[PDB]
From a paper:
We solved the crystal structure of Sas20d1 via sulfur single-wavelength anomalous dispersion (SAD) phasing (2.1 Å, Rw = 17.7%, Rf = 21.4%) and then used this as a model to determine the structure with maltotriose (1.5 Å, Rw = 17.5%, Rf = 19.7%). The N-terminal β-sandwich most closely resembles a CBM26 module, which can be found adjacent to catalytic domains on α-amylases and typically binds maltoheptaose and β-cyclodextrin. In the native structure, the α-helices at the C terminus of Sas20d1 are somewhat disordered with elevated B-factors compared with the rest of the structure, but in the maltotriose-bound structure, this region is well ordered. The Sas20d1 crystals with maltotriose (space group C2) have 45% solvent content and a tightly packed arrangement, with a crystal contact at the helical bundle. In each monomer, the helices (residues 237–257) are sandwiched between the same helical region (residues 237–257) and two β-strands (residues 58–70) of the neighboring monomer within the asymmetric unit and a loop (residues 93–104) of a symmetry-related monomer. This arrangement is in stark contrast to the native crystals, which were of the cubic space group I 21 3 and have ∼62% solvent. Not surprisingly, the pocket of the native structure has an area of ∼783 Å2 and volume of ∼1350 Å3, whereas this space constricts to ∼521 Å2 and a volume of ∼848 Å3 in the maltotriose-bound structure.
Ruminococcus bromii is a keystone species in the human gut that has the rare ability to degrade dietary resistant starch (RS). Here, we performed a structure–function analysis of Sas20 and determined that it features two discrete starch-binding domains separated by a flexible linker.
Residue numbers in the entry: 3 to 237
Write the structure that this text describes.
């Protein structure tokens, strides 16, 4: 069975020019831990499959923090990738974040010609890319942003909708108080399909270490903050 994931770096938006070299920035989302690779470094560089013309990244060659072989993608784990290119005039280009799981092994990412909302700046777009045969379950990484936006795409498989909302409160609620109001959080759950009480319970579980002492994690909203934001009653 195939451990490579493929990238079509030939049929691209006009702005990408003509591809010279291809890179794959792959990271863990849930159920696994991967070390950070270097943007467009040795570890990320893909080779062209002469048979098909597709570039590929072999997940079996991933290494863990200790430098040992990771053993590939895990069952019950979520990942994400950015494919980037350097074109023949040395300009960098990159896809949006695309979700990735074991069922994608052997499949191909292509540019759709569409865009998705950039999670850092809602006035900007990323180039949309998705899977040829797995787009129903993996694709552009849906995200909840620092401003409380819910961007288009696929959600992680092994992370619940309530847990994703709680993660967003954890990351953003204290630092962006004015975007994380009870009514925006309310709309976040509705668009993401998370029941507020489920979010509250998920929050309490996923951030028990962090809620323990505030001085260690000022940016982690205490449960009293979370209940009110969710309109819930821990009672």
């Amino acid at each position: 069975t195939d451990t490579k994931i493929y990238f079509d770096a030939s049929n691209l938006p006009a702005e990408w020019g003509t591809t010279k070299t291809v890179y794959c920035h792959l990271y863990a989302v849930a159920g696994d831990d991967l070390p950070e690779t270097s943007w467009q470094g040795k570890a990320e560089k893909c080779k062209k499959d002469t048979a098909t013309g597709l570039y590929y990244f072999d997940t079996a060659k991933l290494k863990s923090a200790d430098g040992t072989n990771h053993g590939g993608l895990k069952d019950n784990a979520d990942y994400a990738v950015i494919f980037s290119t350097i074109d023949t005039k040395s300009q960098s280009h990159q896809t949006c974040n695309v979700t990735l799981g074991k069922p994608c092994l052997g499949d191909t990412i292509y540019l759709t010609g569409g865009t998705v909302e950039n999670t850092e700046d809602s006035s900007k777009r990323d180039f949309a890319a998705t899977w040829k045969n797995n787009s129903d379950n993996y694709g552009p990484k849906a995200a909840i942003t620092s401003l409380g936006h819910v961007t288009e795409g696929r959600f992680p498989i092994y992370l619940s909708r309530a847990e994703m909302v709680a993660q967003a409160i954890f990351n953003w609620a204290v630092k962006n108080p004015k975007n994380y109001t009870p009514e925006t959080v309310a709309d976040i759950c509705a668009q993401v399909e998370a029941e507020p009480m489920d979010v509250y319970n998920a929050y309490a579980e996923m951030y028990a270490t962090e809620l323990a002492d505030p001085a260690a994690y000022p940016d982690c909203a205490p449960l009293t903050t979370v209940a009110t934001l969710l309109g819930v009653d821990p009672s």
